[PDB]
Design a protein around this ligand. Structure first.
Ligand SMILES: O=P(O)(O)C(F)(F)c1ccc(C[C@](C/C=C/c2ccccc2)(c2nc3ccccc3s2)n2nnc3ccccc32)cc1
Ligand SMILES: [Cl-]
Ligand SMILES: [Mg+2]
Ligand SMILES: [Mg+2]
Length: 289
């Protein structure tokens, strides 16, 4: 039971010997490399937010439109944890229709956003959901209508209830939007407690349930913060599932996730944070209060 003490120790040992940089560099070296031919096609250039961040061909989400099926989004499938996630970039001004089309086609019920909206330079993201109930959004290219139904705003995150309507069939669905608002570019969450609270709220909602399509997770590039978020959730799952939570190899789980999308987790501090968050999360879950 109190074996979590050994975990905290091993963590302190990595901290003390300054090995976060070593583990993270080894991950970068060992990380899978696969082709991204579709992402690089000339016609897809304006569908990519960043020159060097591309989805691998084998795991990319395809849009069900005969024209151009390309979206910068990847399906991460974690077999043992039995969870799936779609990681994508902050939508661009011309890919908001594609983003919601993917949300529709894949049957996701939740969207997790970890960045903030479109600055007046770089490292931005278009305003892809309505800010007011009466100002709904219609994506003509993909024939979808998006309406803001309600919004619960908190200190570090906001949860929104949206209605997504396929204008062709007039069928409508409820999408939950979980927006963590205080996670800086290449930074870490305010604290493990805040992150964990956010994560638990996403879990509690059922958006991560195998009954729905996979949750769509995004930040700006769809790799640093998105990678930190999913890595933490998946490691928590494995620790609860398995008999020995100490047997969970975070580094290894991250390398596994990297087979599906490049660059997941962008700094050694984010790697460290994911370890902290998982250890803390495992205590609260394997706890009683
Ligand atoms: O949490 P996230 O995922 O949103 C993030 F903040 F970590 C993030 C933001 C931006 C980028 C793209 C990158 C960095 C990509 C890194 C990368 C790519 C492939 C694999 C692994 C890592 C950046 N773009 C900008 C723009 C303004 C300021 C700072 C940056 S860093 N980039 N992409 N193409 C480039 C061509 C030339 C230079 C940088 C390039 C990657 C990751
Ligand atoms: Cl990297
Ligand atoms: Mg395949
Ligand atoms: Mg209606």
């Amino acid at each position: 039971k109190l074996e979590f003490m050994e975990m905290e120790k091993e963590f302190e040992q990595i901290d003390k010997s300054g090995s976060w940089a070593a583990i993270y560099q080894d991950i970068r070296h060992e990380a899978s490399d696969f082709p991204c031919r579709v992402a690089k096609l000339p016609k897809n250039k304006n569908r990519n937010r960043y020159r060097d961040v591309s989805p691998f061909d084998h795991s990319r989400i395809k849009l069900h439109q005969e024209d151009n099926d390309y979206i910068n989004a990847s399906l991460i499938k974690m077999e043992e944890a039995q969870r799936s996630y779609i990681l994508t970039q902050g939508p661009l001004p011309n890919t908001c229709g594609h983003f919601w089309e993917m949300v529709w086609e894949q049957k996701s019920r939740g969207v997790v956003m970890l960045n903030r909206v479109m600055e007046k330079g770089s490292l931005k993201c278009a305003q892809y959901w309505p800010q007011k109930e009466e100002k709904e959004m219609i994506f003509e290219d993909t024939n979808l209508k998006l309406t803001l139904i309600s919004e619960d705003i908190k200190s570090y995150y906001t949860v929104r209830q949206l209605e997504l309507e396929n204008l062709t069939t007039q069928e409508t669905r409820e999408i939950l939007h979980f927006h963590y608002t205080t996670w800086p570019d290449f930074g870490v969450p305010e604290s493990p407690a805040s992150f964990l609270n956010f994560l638990f709220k996403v879990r509690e909602s059922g958006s991560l349930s195998p009954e729905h399509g996979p949750v769509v997770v995004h930040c700006s590039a769809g790799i640093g913060r998105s990678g930190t978020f999913c890595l933490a959730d998946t490691c928590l799952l494995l620790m609860d599932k398995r008999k020995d939570p100490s047997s969970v190899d975070i580094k290894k789980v991250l390398l596994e996730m990297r087979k599906f999308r490049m660059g997941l987790i962008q700094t050694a501090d984010q790697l460290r944070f994911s370890y902290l968050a998982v250890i803390e999360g495992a205590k609260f879950i394997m706890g009683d209060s």
